[PDB]
């Protein structure tokens with residue numbers, strides 16, 4: 001698929017707001033994912049044990065993982081579609097080392113969209129959400145094709 005430049009602008013305009021507080025957004029998004037889809041928390045051996053939202057809020061490792069995941073995603077979006085090198089190491093560790101199903105990447109995309117909508121209503125109207133959804137479907141479709149080359153799902 002191909003986003004137009006106007007779509008990339010809408011995505012990079014709300015991402016510039018997320019980058020004012022990367023750790024806070026990282027926490028919100030990982031907690032929204034785990035509450036909504038608790039099976040995904042089993043994939044993180046260093047968190048697994050967390051039982052409540054309060055325990056998640058207070059975990060410095062979960063907050064670090066959020067910053068690590070958002071920073072890598074931010075670096076992919078800033079490429080505007082030219083992200084093949086960035087995607088290679090990321091597809092290899094999520095398919096072979098962590099074993100993350102494409103479905104889980106759909107769940108986090110949902111959690112990202114939920115959090116931006118709550119925190120940034122004025123920059124995340126319908127056209128900006130449509131553009132972010134397109135950018136995340138592009139990311140999921142390029143990662144799924146890599147998985148398939150790497151010997152996982154496809």
Ligand code: HEM
Nearest residue numbers: 040043044065068069072073090093094098100104105108
């Ligand atoms: C926007 C999507 C995602 C991005 C950009 C992302 C990025 C990363 C990055 C950069 C790391 C550190 C290096 C590495 O292992 O490759 C990481 C580790 C990890 N990711 Fe993700 N990830 C994404 C989605 C997910 C999802 C959905 C899950 C779980 C359902 C997952 C589970 C993990 C696990 C288990 C690790 C190891 C964490 C730890 O050992 O500290 N990732 N991810």
